[PDB]
Structure formats: structure tokens, C-alpha cells
Amino acid sequence: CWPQLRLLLWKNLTFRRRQTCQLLLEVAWPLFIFLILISVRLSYPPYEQHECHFPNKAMPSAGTLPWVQGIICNANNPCFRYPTPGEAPGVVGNFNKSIVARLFSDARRLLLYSQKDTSMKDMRKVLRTLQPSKELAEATKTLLHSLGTLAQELFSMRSWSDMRQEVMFLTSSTQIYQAVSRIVCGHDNSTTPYCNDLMKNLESSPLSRIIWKALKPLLVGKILYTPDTPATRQVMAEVNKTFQELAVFHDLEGMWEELSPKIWTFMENSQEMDLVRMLLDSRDNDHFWEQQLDGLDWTAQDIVAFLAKHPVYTWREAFNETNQAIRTISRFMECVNLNKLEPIATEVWLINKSMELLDERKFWAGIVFTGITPGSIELPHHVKYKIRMDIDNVERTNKIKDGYWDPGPRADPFEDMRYVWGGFAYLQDVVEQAIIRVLTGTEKKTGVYMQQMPYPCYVDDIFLRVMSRSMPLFMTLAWIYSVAVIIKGIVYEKEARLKETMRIMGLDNSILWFSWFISSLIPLLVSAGLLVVILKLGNLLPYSDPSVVFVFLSVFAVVTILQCFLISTLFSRANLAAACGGIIYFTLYLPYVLCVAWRDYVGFTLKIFASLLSPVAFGFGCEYFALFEEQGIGVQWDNLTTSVSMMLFDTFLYGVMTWYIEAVFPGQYGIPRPCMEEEPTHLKLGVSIQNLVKVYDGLALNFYEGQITSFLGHNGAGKTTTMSILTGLFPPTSGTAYILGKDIRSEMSTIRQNLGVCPQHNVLFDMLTVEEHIWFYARLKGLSEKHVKAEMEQMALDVGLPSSKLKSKTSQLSGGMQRKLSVALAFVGGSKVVILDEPTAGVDPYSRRGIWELLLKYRQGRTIILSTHHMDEADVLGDRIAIISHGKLCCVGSSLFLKNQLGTGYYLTLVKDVSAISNLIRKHVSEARLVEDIGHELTYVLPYEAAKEGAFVELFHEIDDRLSDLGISSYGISETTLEEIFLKVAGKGSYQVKGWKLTQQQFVALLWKRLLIARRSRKGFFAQIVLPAVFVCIALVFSLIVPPFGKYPSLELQPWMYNEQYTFVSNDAPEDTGTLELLNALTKDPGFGTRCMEGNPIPDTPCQAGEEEWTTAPVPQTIMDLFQNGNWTMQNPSPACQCSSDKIKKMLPVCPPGAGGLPPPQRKQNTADILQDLTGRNISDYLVKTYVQIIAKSLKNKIWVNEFRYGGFSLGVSQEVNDAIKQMKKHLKLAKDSSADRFLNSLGRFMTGLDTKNNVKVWFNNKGWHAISSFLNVINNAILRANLQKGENPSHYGITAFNHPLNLTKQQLSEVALMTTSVDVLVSICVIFAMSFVPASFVVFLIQERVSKAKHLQFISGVKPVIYWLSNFVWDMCNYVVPATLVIIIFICFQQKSYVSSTNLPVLALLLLLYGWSITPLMYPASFVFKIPSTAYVVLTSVNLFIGINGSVATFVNDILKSVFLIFPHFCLGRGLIDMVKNQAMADALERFGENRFVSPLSWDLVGRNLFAMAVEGVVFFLITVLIQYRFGIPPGECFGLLGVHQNMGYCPQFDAITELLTGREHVEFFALLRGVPEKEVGKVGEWAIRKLGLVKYGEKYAGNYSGGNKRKLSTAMALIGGPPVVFLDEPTTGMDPKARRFLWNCALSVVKEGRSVVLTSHSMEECEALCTRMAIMVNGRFRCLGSVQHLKNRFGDGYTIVVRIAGSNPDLKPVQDFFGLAFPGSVLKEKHRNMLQYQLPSSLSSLARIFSILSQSKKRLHIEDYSVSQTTLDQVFVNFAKDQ
């Protein structure tokens, strides 16, 4: 079994090598795919980012100055890469090095000191006393002390010394930025054009691009509120106070203008300044000043120089600088809108005013209070308010998350930070604080800070994940090509009956399947190894062992090969299977991507039950590979095992299914599973049949060695069954068959080793040479190398191709040479018993004679068993003819015995009065009669038993005597043929219709034929109507699940919008009662917010009742010992872990347990979430470590990891001045209703609104889109509930905030309407792909009818092919229209207002109609150049899909492009659909906004140009299709057969040309309707033709299910429908059966005898000599008689043939042979047998009387028993004419 496997492997490798066309592409396709993949990979490098923290943002309630400082400088999330000091639980600053803060603190200190200072009083007292004494010295000392204290207080500021330097340095790109960052924080018709171009150059400068967007809605915006309720009025007045807190710079200009002259005259010409300047320079005061100054700068000399009078830095310069600064800050503040408060009556007017202000580019958010009942009391204890703002300034409310998870803290300052720079959080906090202050009436000041949670050193490698999760597509493209190739190969080897021949030679299917598996696995394994190598080298899958991926790809190759072995058992056409394999593989892989989208509810059992396919298992393996690759550790030898096990189970299942289907459902050739002469005993016996039986008798026949015995039968008895049983593959019955002494049922393998079989089909492999065939067959026989070479040389010498030009050439020989080689190949191995099956089927007589010579040369003891339907072959070759019938043996014996036992007498033929010759013959012969009389031919019959006494000689002498009297020109005599013995043993309409009505009749006939072939196709090509239907159905059901992408509902800001989350509360500095009560109110019965309190005022979220436990999670002993080691302080409280080392890219840092440090006490807060106490713990490090470890643990299980925590809280701790200011205002220059009073009040308010007792940091995760506002509302509600007194039941006390964006403007609606292409193009492509399936049926029907089936056969008669094409187009439109209408109704069923509208439906309908009308003729010329059916479907579908994708990409993107792309109807339909949807969307947007537009879609600009374009395109395409086709002596009753005007000629093609879906009578009815037969008598003509050509019992049956004889009879019936004067036939009886060819011959004779000549061409000379009368051999062409029949047999024919048999036997008589040789001089020994001789006499036919005389005289002397004399045949004359060429 090993040499056979080696031979099969060699044959497969040689088949693969000799092509040199598929293997190089099989190698280059995956190479190109992976090169494109690595080229795309090299363009997207991985994005690495270090771990970093974010600063804390200050809200307006935490002070105006810190809020402004946080807004201005740190507004870009610098991600400082280190824990900022603001994240510490104690300090909430990070603005300690600010200069503005120091200046404000120094100003506050100076203001507080100026009240207690009384130096002015002492100076006035000294001035009054001076205007020496005792109290004068004490007064002077007190004045000096006060002056020294004032100087020490003034010189300790040092704030203006830096601000002045900064402002002079302000008046190179990074220098100004650094100066601003140092001065701020740490490290047109409406307004004047001044602020206009100020803002213009601010937007035009690359310095405030991140600051102007945040400062625009602060000083330009405007706030509106509804309704006009006194409670709303109070809360908005509080908001206005909060806003005007920073209005101190407004009333400063008036104060400066009022206090400038006073201070000027006080410093210029006042006595106080004079006394101060006089007391500064002296002899003893210098030491006092030097001591009081403590060595600081600006000594007394500088003091006198600065405070001098009439003057380098004098106080006048500082005065002018202060004046200029006040002037410029007033000019800046002049256009700062601080009156942003507008009350509106109702909501719709508020929205209208909001849109109007948005059109004016000055509009901030608007508050809408719900449930107020205008006219009410202070508050209803539950305030509900919504904040409406522009969609470009707030986060979207349609979704709360990004969808698919990805690393990254989402900290973009502009794209995902609209809640900060948009102004939502600030205004929300202000409104919440105002509501709290109005509800409680308290004076507490609690600040709120926004701290963002840091991220633990993430990297971005999304491309790697996408490539590793979408691997199967690129991994299986080239493999789909390869499996298509191998499927084509398998189906080609199966269809050519090669597997049946291998099984006949003694081979099992197991070894064939194994050889195919190996030959398909070798190149697949090579490709898998190369792909593994290129993946390891190209850094596409690094840190991965090549061995595991190599074995994975090997298992994938094995399972794909077994899938192909399963699929190949369902097809019978090589090209069709090759085209369908890739589609089947694609639709079998599609389940993987279908399941990967809905994997949220996919269980393990469902995955296992769905893992019966190979692509889904490969996808699961690739997902596991990606999961183990994204963490940098890779996959090595250590899920995947389950995937490999499922793939092996799939291989086993595919193998079992293949073994089952091959047995139960085989092809059209397999078997499905649930007158006796004396036997010559002088030779050897090879086969012995004894009582063979079957399923519905007795067979006793013996075959001898040195004889070529025949086996005849009607193919209906037990002849073919017995021949098959003798060859094996069939279980025998209760009988015996001893082949060379071996029983069939006993041993079958020993018999097949020496048994040659030659079936009807020639067995020759393609791409192979004849010497390779000989070698392969000889090696499969079982011979050694020397015997193989000897047999090859002998066969090359015997066949007749001893030349290197034919031995090394492929199967390019003629049919005769191929048949001769196939016959000779059955004699390899020295087989002692051979069984032939119909040799020389359709070869010319020369190749027939050659094969006969080869068979006679291979007769030396080989037991040749002939089996053919030809009688002349079995007569001239069969030595013992055996004819059986009815399953039993009827006759057996030699040719002479069978002809002389039950045959008829000789047949004489005279070729030129018929009564004189008949009377003479009846006078000479006893019982003679006339057989036939045809044109120049008279044939009679004579009894063979008569004329034995010597009457033959006298008759021949009488004929030769008066031969010139009669008109006979030549005479001949022959014997009885074997065909007669085998047969003995077993349309007109009375008038023509050709004319004007003939065209209409042909049109209606073609339409009727097409309707009949389309109606009877319920099982055939009927999917062309239901497949586009379901395609459009699924395309529409896919378009009803996509959101409109233009809706923003009212989203309630609550932290419970997510399923599960973790919270935390950190009580820092637990020594204050306020922080303790705030923590209590935050962790009391009401809970965090308004989730559950006296009910559930939030939809679809009920609260839990009982959950209260302060428990700690267990900890292993390892971490316990690690932390008992010690040295774990606040700084570095846990072992950190590195991330993204060199050459190792890690998505998240992995490190051993103990990263968090300790499990904090967790407790469920009765709100579907748990909180953990983090008091006294490092918040940032703990959060980072817990987040990274939780994400790692959740990703290690592959459970679609999502966010873990969202928010947490950290509580901590941070009038006299006002009183002093009031005293100063009253004490000095007191006034009222002036600018000074207002400025002092504003300054006092600003100084008061900057100190906060306690504060809370709200840690929020920016991954949640609405996480900051939710927890802000929560902490505001907690602050509200903490400020309640006397126990007001804080359960029903809460504040609810909403987020509802305003209505979209015109531009936004236009962009939303235009952004629908991403949905429209998919529907357009799906509709195009569904509608491009109808013309494919028409084009494949045209291809099927084009290959000599119906086109040329109808063109033979007058059919006017233009009318044929017109009828085809009409029927295609009528078929296309019904399906188009059905699709339109299906579309109409659904409610798609974009199409069902009264202005979109008829235009949609006519567009589809025109698309069909234009696409029908486009594919018409594609059927011309296609010499294969059932294959253009997939190619044309791929071309249409490519054109559709090209049009879609062109529409995606221009005028000239759209103008020239109109030639494609798919592009036209796509553009029409796109324009229709766009017009509908624009009209809907205009109706929604309040406009009116009635633009009809039928305008020539939008839609209507494409319609005319497609119409003219279809017209010119039909014209081009019509023009392409055009490319711009035989007397009556003479069968003049060529032995090499349209309506009056009949034609019969060689190959059968019938439709497989029509009946027998319908064919002749259609052909009569085409031949000008009236519709009235067309049925009578059809019935007449049916009765003439037989098959009456099969008149109503599909012609496709007929047999060869039935198809030939149908062709003959069609050939004589109209009754032409001359009918042309080509091979009428080919491969038929006796008793059936005689019927066609008699029909032809009856046709020709009625005065209608026939012209028949064929290869069998027996049919020609039995039918034709004049062998018109047109060597020179045209018409030329070649001397009839008998004339040609007597003129150029050979001599006679005499077969003689001796009376004596055992074994023969040499004297008879000697006398026969001595009698005739030209006697040749044609065949010498035992008791049987035959001889040939050339050039001695004219003396036949003398030959008969000598035979009669020698019968008694030579002891002759039987004799026979016959003439030459027609095939002998043919080979004689062809041998001399």
C-alpha cells in the first residue's frame, strides 16, 4: 500500500508542478497581503504615555481669586508626571508662589493696619503743641515710634517691586508666556471697536487659544432664567451677588478721580509731609532709622530720595504709574458684562431668546426651574432645575460612555473637557450654592474643588489589538484562494471518472483521500511556516514563540483541508465548485463576526455549540493571542487548548460527514447506499460463468485464452450487469465466476492484479505525457523498474509513436491516437484477462483499423472480451460471438455458424424494367424475391440452402451473358450481416404563414418558450426572485437599529447612571465639628443624593433597604508580613511597579500583590454601591494601584472589562477687616451716595468673599461623561442637608439638576442632515448588490443557449435574429419588472418616510425600472465570449460589486467626475438614492425649523439626469449588442452523403441541442411555430412528428432527463418538422443501441423515398452503406457525385472473401489448404484457425462463376462442410482511399 501512496503523491506533485500557473500566485497572494499589512503597521507607531496627575480646579464658591487663577493659567491639564501638592489630604493650594495673591494679602494687611495706626493723631498733636516743653519730648518720641512702625509696615510688602518689573517687561514667543504664567499663578456696532480689535488680536494670537475659549462665556455671555417667581428672583439675586463679587474694579476709576487731588496736595504742599521729610535727615535719627530698618534695603537715603519735594525715583513717578494702571484696567473692564441676568416668562420664549442671543454670539447657559407654580412661598423643599446651553459647549446627552473600552484618562482640555471651559460646572455650583443659601438661610462658606483621578502609565496600541482581533480575514483570504484551487482539482479528478478507474484498478478511497490530504497539506504547511516567520520578523506579533503559532496554523490548515474534503462531496462541476468554495467559506466565517458583535450575552455552552466551525475557533484563538499579547508577556508553552480540541473535533466530524456523504449520495455514475455450437476445448480456459443471477436467471458461458470473444446485448438484459460483476465493485449472487481459477466472492484482490479493464471513457490525465502515463500505469500494475522499462519500450514500438516529439508531449494528440493509447494502456502489467468496453466509439475508420491491428497483435493468449454495439466490428473481430437476451444466453458460436444456422440467404445487388430480371431470377432460383429498389440499385435475396446443386454457376453465366441487354452496369453479392441476426434473435399546415405575420408568430413563440422555461423552473433558478428580497429585507432591518445621531434628551445628573461603581470618603483633619457634621449628613439615611428618599423620584432605580456593616476584606499572610516588616510611611506607602521598559511594550504595569497596601473598610450605602473609608491614606497612590490591579484582574478573565470607580469625596479644613474698613470710611472723609462709598463696599465684599473655613475635594473619573456634575450635585445636596437645623427631616430635602441642550441652529441641523451618508451609502450598496442579481440569470441562460444549443439552430431557419434579441429584451424586462415591483412593495411595507412619501415613491420606482432597463443590455455582450456556462454569475456579480464600491467611494470623496461617471448604472442608482435621502433630510430640517420648500426631486439637477442617462445608455447598449452579432447534382430522392434556401433546408446537429426544462412535444411545437406552421395545425404537426419518430410513451417528459438515443430521436424529429426538400443530418445514431438505430434508418429511408433527398454525414461506414445511395465525396468541396455505392465497391474495392470450413477435424487438413493455394494464384491467408480458414481474392471478382464452380467441385474432394462468399465493404474502400494520402 506504500508504493501506491508514493505513486499517488508523485502524480499529485507532478500535477502541481506542470501547471506553473497556480503555485506562484498561491505563494504571492499571502506575501502581498502580509506586506500590505506590515506597510499599514509601519505607519501607525504605538503611543506611549507616562503616569501623571492633574491639578485641582477651583469652583466660584471657593473664592473668586483662586477660581480665576485656576481658569487662566492651569487650563490645559499639564499632567505633571508627579503627585501635585493639591492632591495631598491637607493642602488644597498649589498657588503659593503667586504674586497677585501676595499683593492682595499685603493690601489686606495694610488695610487692617491703617485702622489701628494713629500716627496722624500724634502728628496733629505735635503740630498743635509746636504752634522746649515737657510733653513735647514725649510727643516727639511717640511720633518717631509711630513713623518707624509705619515705615517697617510699608517696606515689608515687596509686592509692587515685582509687579512693576513684570509690567515693564511685558511692554520672544515663550518669554511673554513665561511672564504671564509667573504673573498669574505659580509654576461691532454694539460695543466700542477698542474691545472689538482687542478680542480680534486675542483670537489671532497663539497664546490664548486654550484661554479665550474659557474666557468668552465669562465676560460676554448672558444668563436667562424662568419663571418670574419671587423665589427665583431671590436665588438669581444671590447669583448676581456671587457674580458682582468680582466687580471691585468697576468703581475704582471714580475713587481714583476723587482721591487724586487730595493725595497730591497732601504729598506736595502739606505740613505733615514737610515735618516727615524734616525728621528723616538729622545727626541722631540716622542711627535710629538704621536700627529700626534691621539692615533691610531702601535705607533712609532712599526714603528721602523717594519722598522728596520738587525734584531718581520720586513718588510722582509711582503716582503716574498707578494712574496709568487704573486707567488701563478701567478701559479693560469697560466691556466686561456683569449684568448677565434676564427673567423670561415661559419656556418657549426663553428658547427663542436663547436662539436670538446665540445668533448674536453673546449667550451663556440658562436655568429653567420646574415645579414652581408662579406665586408661591420661599421654596417647595425640592428644587428641580435644568441648565440649557449650546451643544458646542457641553457634553452630549445621547451617550454616557465611549462605548468600546480603551486606555487613556480622557483628559483633553478641549475635546473632552467641555464641562470646564464651557461654563457648566461653575454656573451649576453657583446655582446650587444660591439654592442652599435661600433654603437654609445660613452664612457658612464651604468650598468645592475638582480633582481628576490619575492614570497608571497607559500605552496606546489600538492598531495591534485591531490587527490581532481581525486576523482571520487576512489569514484566510489566501487560504480561500488555495482551497478554491484544491476544490477545483478534486472535482476535476472526480468528474473525469478517474476515481472510478482508480477504484477499478484495485485502489481504495482511503489511500486517495490520504494522498490528497498530504498533497494539500505540504504547501499549506509551507505557507503557514512562511507566515509565522514573517510575523515574527515584522514585529506584528512580538514576544511570541513561533512554535505555538506554527502548530496553530498547522491545525488550521488541517481543519480547512478536511472542510474542503467535506464540501467537495456536494458538487459535480469543477469551475462551479471552485467559484462556490470561496463564497461558502465566507458565509461560514461570517458567523464569527456576527457573534463577536453581540458577545455581551454569549455563554460557554453557546460558544461550544457554535464552535463546530473552524473560523470561529480560529477567531477565539486569535482573541486569546491578542489578550496575551497586549500585556507584553506574549503567549508561549505554559482558551487555546479548548480551541485546539474543538478544531480537532471539527476535523473528526468533517471526516465522518465526508465518509457518510460519499456513500449515501454519490455522483450520477456510482451506486447509492441505503444455437449452441461445440465448445472448442483445444485452447486454454480463462473465465467460467456458472448460473449467474441478480435482482430480477442462468448464464453458462466459458471464455478461452487465444480467442477474441464478443459479448452483445441490448443494454437492458443481464449483459452489462454481468460485465460489471466480472470486473468487481458489485456483490455477486448464488452463482460462480472462476476467472483463471479464482472465485469472485472468495478472492478479489488476487484477480485484479492480472485483470485489465478498458471502459468507454478514455482514461488520460491532463498536463502529463504519454510516457508518464505508461510509467504510472505499469508501476501501479506491480512491476519492477526493468519490467516497466521493457513494457514501455514494447508499447512505444507497438502503438506507433516511437518519437521524442510525441513521447515528451502532453495529451495534445488527435482523438484516434488518444483512444488508441487508452486502449493500449489496458494491456499493461501482462494481464492474462482483459475486458474492453466499446472500443473505437467515434474515431475515423483509419484509427479503427489501427486499433483493430493493435488488438490482433495483442491476441497471443490474453482472453480479450469485446463488448460493443457495432455489428461489423464484432463480426470481423469476434471469434466466438455470444448473444444473450432476457438475462439468459441465447446464441453462441462463430460468425459462419451463426450466419449459416438461422441467418438468411445471400443478397445480390445490381447497379445501373424490374419485372424481367425478377422473372429470370425466379426461374433460376427456387424461392427468390425482391428486397429493395432504390435509385440505380436493385437488391434481391437468395436462399443459402438453395442453388447448392450448381444453380449459382448457371445463374451467374446467364447474368454475364445478357449483361449488355439490360441496364445493369455492375453486379455484386454479399452475405448476411450480424445486425439482421441480432434483430431476429432479440407535418404541414396546408398553407404557409411566412410574411408579415411570421415575425409576430416567431415573437409569440419565443415568448411562450421563455415563459414555459421560466415557469417550470420552480426547482431551478428561482432564487433570483427571493434572494434579492431577503437581501433588501435584511438591509432595511439593519437600517432600523442605527440611532438618528441627532437627539439630545434631558439627562438627569446622577452618579447612579452606571451599573456598578466604587466610592470613597476621606475625612481629613477629624478635629472640627463642621467637617464631622458634613460627613454625617453625607453618610446618613438620605444617602448621597436624591436616589431614594420618601420614595424613588428617579425612574427605574429602586433603593435597597437593609445594608449596614463596617467590615474589612481578608488579607493573606504574605502581605501581612510584608507590612509588618515596617518602613511604610505616608511617602511611598506601597511597593510601586515599573511600566513600558525598553524593548517591552506593556499596556498596564504588572506588579505583585500589596500595591494598594491594605483593604479599607467597605460598606454598602443602600444605593446599589459600596463606599470605603480612606481616612489617613495616600489617596493618589492607592487609587492608581487599585485601579490598575482591578483592571488587570478583570482583563485576565476576558470579560469585556469596563470602568471600576467614578467618584469620591475628601473633606478637609483650610468680619474684622470689614469693620475696620467701615470705621475708616466713617472716621475720615465720611460720605454717602458717591463712588468712594460704593468702591469701599465692593472692596470689603471682595475681601470677605475669599476666606473659607472648610472645603471638599471631589475626585472624579473623566471616563464617565457626566461623572463630575453628578458628584458635584451630590456634594451640594450633602452640604444642603448638613446646614439644616432643628431637625427638619432632611429626607425630603434635595436638589435635582438636569442637562438638556438647546435646539440646534440652522448650521447644526444642516451638518446633521449632511452627516447621514455613513448610513445611506450602506443601504445604497446593499440595494445595488441585491438588484444586480436578476440579469445574471438572463446572461447565464443566454450563455447556455449560445453554445450550439438554440442560437445557431434557430438562425438556420428564418428567425430574423434582431427579432430574437428584441424578444429576449422584452421578456427580460417583463421578468425584471415583476421582481422590481415585488421589491418596491416590500420596501413600502415598512415605514421609511424617506421613500414611502408621495413624492419619493414613484421617482424610486421609475429609477429602479430605468436601472433594470439599462443594466439588462449591458451584460448582453458579456455572454458572447464565454465558452462555459454556470460560471459568469460570480464574475459578473464581483464586477458589479466592484463598480458599486467604486461609485460609493467616489460619492464619499468633482463636477466633471460626476458628469463622466453617469455611464455606470450602479453609480446612477447610488447617486439617485443619495440625493433623494439628502433632499428628504433637508426638507425635514426646513419644516422643523419653520421654513417652506417644495423642491421636487425630479429636477434635472438633483434626480432626473441619471434617468435620461440610463435610458440612452440602455438604448445604445442594445444597439451595440445588435450590431456586434452582425459585426457591422442533388436530385429529388438521392441520399448524397458527403464521405469526406434557408427555409427549404432541415438541419440535425451532431451534439444534442435541447433545453433541459422543456418537454418533448413542446420542442417540436416551438420549432413548428418557428418554421411557419399555423397555430391551428401546429398540434397536429407535432403529433405527426411524435408518431413518426417514436418515443410516444415519453412524449410528456423533461428533455434534460432523456438518454442519448432519446435525444438523438428528438433531434431527428426536429430536423423534419417543416418538411424541407433537403434535410442535413450529422451523426444521427451515435452511441445508440440496435433495434433503435434501425428505426432511425427506416425513418430516413421513408423520408428519402418520398422524393426528398437527404444529406447525412457520419463516421460509421455501415450506416452510410445501408442508407446512402451516392457517396458524394467532395474532396474539392461543393457538390460532386462520387459514384454511388456498389459502383464504388466494385471499381475501387478489393477482391472477394471466402471463409471455408472442413468436414474433418482433429485438428485440420493440410491438403485442403494446399489445394486452395494452388487453385487461385492471388490467394492470401487472412486467418488460419483450427477447422476454419479464410482467404481473400483480389482482382478476381469478374470470374465469380468460375470460383463458385471450383468451390462446388472441391466441396466433395476437400471434404468441405460450410462455405461463404462475400464482397468488400465500404470501410475497406475508405481506408484504401485514405492509405495512399
Ligand SMILES: *[C@@H]1O[C@H](CO)[C@@H](O[C@@H]2O[C@H](CO)[C@@H](O[C@@H]3O[C@H](CO[C@@H]4O[C@H](CO)[C@@H](O)[C@H](O)[C@@H]4O)[C@@H](O)[C@H](O[C@@H]4O[C@H](CO)[C@@H](O)[C@H](O)[C@@H]4O)[C@@H]3O)[C@H](O)[C@H]2NC(C)=O)[C@H](O)[C@H]1NC(C)=O
Ligand atoms: C503618595 O505616594 C506618592 C508616590 O507613591 C508620593 O509621591 C512621591 O513624593 C514626591 C511627590 O511630591 C516626589 O518627589 C519628587 O521627586 C522628583 C523625582 O526627581 C528625581 O528624584 C530622584 C529621587 O527619587 C533624585 O535622585 C533625582 O535627582 C531627581 O530629583 C523630584 O524631581 C522632585 O523634586 C522637585 O523638583 C521640582 C523641579 O525641580 C522642584 O520645583 C520641587 O521643589 C522639587 O524639588 C520631588 O522631590 C516623589 O518622587 C514621589 N514618588 C516617590 C516614589 O517617592 C506622594 O508624596 C505620597 N503622598 C503623600 C501625601 O506623601
Ligand SMILES: *[C@@H]1O[C@H](CO)[C@@H](O[C@@H]2O[C@H](CO)[C@@H](O)[C@H](O)[C@H]2NC(C)=O)[C@H](O)[C@H]1NC(C)=O
Ligand atoms: C445685578 O448685578 C448687576 C451688576 O453686578 C447690576 O447692574 C448694575 O446696576 C445698574 C443696572 O441695574 C447699572 O447702572 C450699573 O452700572 C450695573 N453695574 C454695576 C457694577 O453697578 C444689576 O442691577 C443687578 N440686578 C439685580 C436684580 O440685583
Ligand SMILES: CC(C)CCC[C@@H](C)[C@H]1CC[C@H]2[C@@H]3CC=C4C[C@@H](O)CC[C@]4(C)[C@H]3CC[C@]12C
Ligand atoms: C494704593 C496706594 C495706597 C499704595 C501706596 C503704597 C506705595 C505708594 C508705596 C508702598 C511701598 C512702596 C514701594 C517699596 C519698594 C519699592 C522698590 C523700589 O525698587 C522702587 C520703589 C518701590 C516700588 C516703592 C514704590 C512705592 C510703594 C509701592
Ligand SMILES: CC(C)CCC[C@@H](C)[C@H]1CC[C@H]2[C@@H]3CC=C4C[C@@H](O)CC[C@]4(C)[C@H]3CC[C@]12C
Ligand atoms: C482551470 C483553472 C486552472 C482555472 C480556474 C479559474 C480560477 C482560478 C479563477 C476563475 C474565477 C475566479 C474566482 C472568481 C470569484 C471569486 C469570488 C471571490 O470572493 C474570491 C475569489 C474567487 C473565488 C475567484 C478565485 C479564482 C477563480 C476561481
Ligand SMILES: *[C@@H]1O[C@H](CO)[C@@H](O)[C@H](O)[C@H]1NC(C)=O
Ligand atoms: C504655601 O505653602 C507654604 C508652606 O510651604 C506656606 O508657608 C504658604 O503660606 C502657602 N501659601 C499660601 C497658603 O498662599
Ligand SMILES: *[C@@H]1O[C@H](CO)[C@@H](O)[C@H](O)[C@H]1NC(C)=O
Ligand atoms: C425645540 O425642540 C423641541 C423638541 O421637539 C420642540 O418641541 C420645540 O418646539 C423646539 N423649539 C424651537 C424654538 O425650535
